[PDB]
Design a protein around this ligand. Structure first.
Ligand SMILES: Cn1ccnc1[C@]1(CNC(=O)c2cc3cc(Cl)ccc3o2)NC(=O)NC1=O
Ligand SMILES: [Ca+2]
Ligand SMILES: [Ca+2]
Ligand SMILES: [Ca+2]
Ligand SMILES: [Zn+2]
Length: 214
């Protein structure tokens, strides 16, 4: 039942600034509002409030390898944070949007990357998103699902939890997301356990000065 608030640092690279220009801040808050709406959907079972508290427009090394862009960004974002959650400048997770075509080992179909189950570890609570211009909120929600310890819905543990009957955020590839069920039962279970085990202990304080859309 506890309200959970994820104090979020949103970062946009030079490519995002070059393309969106003056409309970038509004764009990022719109994307994040949409991701936040996903995280309040009842299907998640333990809803959380994704709150933008800091917004940086650019830094870290951004290139084709998603793995090394994520590692670079995650090292870089540490520097902006503060040691204690009591500090207003402290943030719980860092998310980077870039126009760089991010790639895996064999193709560039990837749209983002995050390490799994890291949300209250400031050294590790990181995600990167390739901005496609239309579905970026869904990619952000997928990466943030991983940060909240979620697996893909075609994983073995998820088959048992979902049943037998690709329409959710944690599908392995983007497909059309069910508006009545953005999160599978597997997704809800994994975030619920993560929080029940005390891994969301940094999500309990309420942010001071959230950034709001007009
Ligand atoms: C880790 N990795 C390594 C190689 N490729 C990856 C992937 C690829 N998938 C995506 O980029 C991506 C975006 C998206 C949005 C929706 Cl709604 C549903 C599914 C989605 O998948 N990155 C990731 O986060 N998981 C992966 O398998
Ligand atoms: Ca705080
Ligand atoms: Ca890509
Ligand atoms: Ca916090
Ligand atoms: Zn994934």
């Amino acid at each position: 039942s506890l309200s959970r608030f994820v104090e979020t640092l949103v970062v946009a690279d030079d490519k995002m600034a070059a393309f969106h220009g003056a409309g970038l801040k509004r764009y990022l808050l719109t994307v994040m509002a949409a991701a936040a709406k996903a995280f309040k959907h009842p299907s998640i079972r333990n809803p959380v409030s994704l709150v933008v508290t800091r917004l940086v427009i650019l830094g870290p090394q951004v290139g084709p390898s998603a793995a090394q862009t994520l590692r670079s960004f995650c090292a870089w974002q540490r520097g902006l944070n503060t040691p204690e959650d009591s500090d207003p400048d402290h943030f719980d997770t860092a998310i980077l949007f870039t126009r760089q075509d991010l790639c895996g080992v064999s193709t560039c179909d990837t749209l983002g990357m995050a390490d799994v189950g890291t949300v209250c570890d400031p050294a590790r609570s990181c995600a990167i998103v390739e901005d496609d211009g239309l579905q970026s909120a869904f990619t952000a929600a997928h990466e943030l699902g991983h940060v909240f310890n979620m697996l893909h819905d075609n994983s073995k543990p998820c088959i048992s939890l979902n049943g037998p009957l690709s329409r959710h955020v944690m599908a392995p590839v983007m497909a059309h997301v069910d508006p009545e069920e953005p999160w599978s039962p597997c997704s809800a279970r994994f975030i619920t356990d993560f929080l029940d085990n005390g891994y969301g202990h940094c999500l309990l304080d309420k942010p001071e000065a959230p950034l709001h859309l007009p």
